[PDB]
Design an enzyme around this catalytic site. Structure first.
Site, PDB file in Angstrom:
ATOM      1  N   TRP A 130      25.266   4.919  45.649  1.00 49.81           N
ATOM      2  CA  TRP A 130      24.603   3.613  45.695  1.00 49.81           C
ATOM      3  C   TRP A 130      25.589   2.551  45.214  1.00 49.81           C
ATOM      4  CZ3 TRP A 130      20.341   1.532  47.707  1.00 49.81           C
ATOM      5  CH2 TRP A 130      19.333   2.406  48.158  1.00 49.81           C
ATOM      6  N   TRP A 161      11.088 -21.647  46.584  1.00 50.01           N
ATOM      7  CA  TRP A 161      11.073 -21.283  45.168  1.00 50.01           C
ATOM      8  C   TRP A 161      10.421 -22.383  44.338  1.00 50.01           C
ATOM      9  CZ3 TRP A 161      12.055 -16.397  44.851  1.00 50.01           C
ATOM     10  CH2 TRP A 161      12.972 -15.803  45.741  1.00 50.01           C
TER      11      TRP A 161
END
Ligand SMILES: Cc1cc2nc3c(=O)[nH]c(=O)nc-3n(C[C@H](O)[C@H](O)[C@H](O)COP(=O)(O)OP(=O)(O)OC[C@H]3O[C@@H](n4cnc5c(N)ncnc54)[C@H](O)[C@@H]3O)c2cc1C
Length: 474
Positions: A285, A313
């Site tokens: 990962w 946002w």
């Protein structure tokens, strides 16, 4: 004479170092160096804990070079100016270093190399912090991966490299050489305080190559066998704690892989085998996100996917402040933020939670969180940190369907006995785990601990609403 300079940045160790090893095969007159770059050190995004860990690593590195036969040169200033000047003053046969995956490092590197070439000095840039370079892992069409699954399938099948040799019997610089470079050198390694920093919160693993190696060996000797499922619980010390060692290269990625691999070959238990494979997956990962940053540098700019570049946002500064101060009123969230600010490290399950909370609940441009993490993480890493925050909204690589973590569910699921909560929120040790998990605490019993700053259910609806409205608008 004709010595080779090896430029250290995120590979603060003498062992299992690709570039250093390559350089040693070309010359024993191998001189290390580290440049304190003001653009990085003076950055508002620099974490005090990271500078402390770094400084600790450099201290050992000075000794390692001294014991090897030469030394570690120290400088403070702009790399593309100082490094070439130093190499020129030393009539260096070449300057070696390991490649970066980050925008800043790669741009800088291009400039140093070009500067060196103009001076007629050879610059060699090799891959060291990844088991496989970004150019090695491509699809059948020769393209990078933006989905984990397929990346892992490729990465997994690739032959794994082994640790390279530690350079020995080095030749140190002479007085005449030292005189030629005097003006460019710091007389000694500055202390944390001299740099203008202060840190007393400790580390997940003591600074230095030696301590890193010891931790890797200890972890792979026992704890790793229970990695799965111990990795899921913040209360349990089930992870390696090697993150800063990997970020600064106190340990080599090949040593890490080999140690885990040897543990897997030594184990005769299926569960342990699986636990070790899972840990190895974590390293995969790591390369997925580093490769991604390399292939898609714009990822560092913020929300990657188009839809997200347009998310409305809310950005209520007050909610953010409360988040950064561990005053959200959500025990699991506050206990995590406290551990972060106090120790410069946070259990991954907790990072996932507080990130989900900040982005989904508080509805704040996750870049504010990414920045706050970088300002406090001893392992603060662009590729991993950005990956983590893009993840809190599926706005980048490996996107998944819209989802919002329920703080209570996560807390109950991963800290069922509220042991972790109580640990970092001692002023709530008297409260019952039951309530610390639900986040519903009676005022009196809440003492000074703040009440929830937002109603999860209302925030959840608000976020989904904005998402869908925008999704439709598009
Ligand atoms: C929002 C958020 C931000 C993050 N910030 C960073 C950061 O700045 N720096 C950092 O290195 N990691 C980051 N992570 C990933 C992760 O939380 C850590 O690497 C982990 O907490 C390190 O503890 P450990 O060394 O004990 O990990 P272990 O579980 O022992 O894993 C071993 C190594 O694998 C790597 N790793 C594990 N998890 C992942 C992953 N999810 N992504 C990338 N690499 C991984 C790390 O190098 C780690 O040291 C972030 C995750 C989230 C959700």
């Amino acid at each position: 004479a004709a010595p080779i300079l090896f430029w250290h940045r995120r590979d603060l160790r003498l062992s299992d170092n690709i570039g250093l090893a390559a350089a040693r095969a070309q010359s024993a007159q191998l001189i290390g160096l580290f440049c304190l770059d003001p653009q990085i050190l003076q950055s508002a995004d620099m974490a005090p804990a990271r500078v402390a860990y770094l400084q600790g690593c450099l201290q050992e590195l000075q000794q390692r070079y001294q014991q090897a036969g030469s030394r570690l040169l120290l400088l403070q200033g702009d790399p593309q100016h100082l490094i070439p000047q130093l190499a020129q003053q030393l009539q260096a046969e070449a300057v070696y270093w390991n490649q970066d995956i980050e925008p800043y490092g790669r741009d800088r590197d291009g400039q140093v190399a070009a500067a060196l070439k103009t001076a007629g000095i050879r610059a060699v840039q090799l891959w060291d912090q990844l088991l496989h370079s970004p150019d090695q892992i491509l699809s059948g069409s020769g393209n990078p991966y933006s989905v984990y699954g397929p990346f892992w399938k490729n990465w997994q099948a690739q032959p794994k490299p082994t640790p390279v040799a530690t350079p020995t019997e080095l030749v140190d610089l002479s007085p005449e050489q030292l005189t030629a470079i005097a003006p460019l050198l710091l007389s000694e390694l500055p202390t944390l305080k001299q740099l203008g920093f202060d840190w007393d919160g400790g580390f997940p693993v003591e600074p230095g190559e030696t301590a890193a190696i010891a931790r890797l060996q200890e972890f792979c000797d026992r704890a790793i066998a229970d990695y799965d499922p111990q990795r899921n619980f913040p209360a349990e010390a089930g992870t390696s704690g090697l993150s800063p060692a990997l970020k600064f290269g106190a340990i080599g990625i090949r040593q890490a892989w080999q140690a885990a691999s040897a543990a897997h070959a030594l184990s005769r238990s299926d569960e342990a085998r699986n636990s070790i494979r899972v840990w190895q997956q974590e390293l995969a990962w790591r390369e997925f996100y580093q490769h991604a940053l390399y292939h898609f540098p714009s990822l560092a700019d913020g929300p990657y996917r188009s839809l997200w570049q347009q998310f409305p946002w809310e950005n209520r500064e007050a909610l953010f402040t409360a988040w950064t101060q561990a005053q959200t009123g959500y025990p699991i969230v506050d206990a995590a933020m406290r551990q972060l600010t106090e120790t410069g490290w946070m259990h991954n399950r907790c990072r996932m939670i507080v990130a989900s909370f900040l982005t989904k609940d508080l509805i704040i441009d996750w870049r504010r969180g990414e920045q706050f993490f970088m300002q406090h993480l001893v392992d603060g890493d662009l590729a991993a940190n950005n990956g983590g925050w893009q993840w809190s909204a599926s706005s980048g690589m490996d996107p998944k369907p819209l989802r919002i973590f329920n703080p209570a569910s996560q807390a109950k699921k991963f800290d069922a006995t509220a042991t972790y909560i109580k640990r970092w929120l001692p002023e709530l040790r008297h409260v019952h785990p039951k309530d610390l998990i639900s986040g519903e605490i009676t005022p009196i019993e809440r003492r000074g601990y703040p009440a929830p700053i937002v109603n999860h259910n209302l925030r959840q609806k608000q976020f989904k609403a904005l998402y869908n409205q925008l999704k439709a608008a598009i």
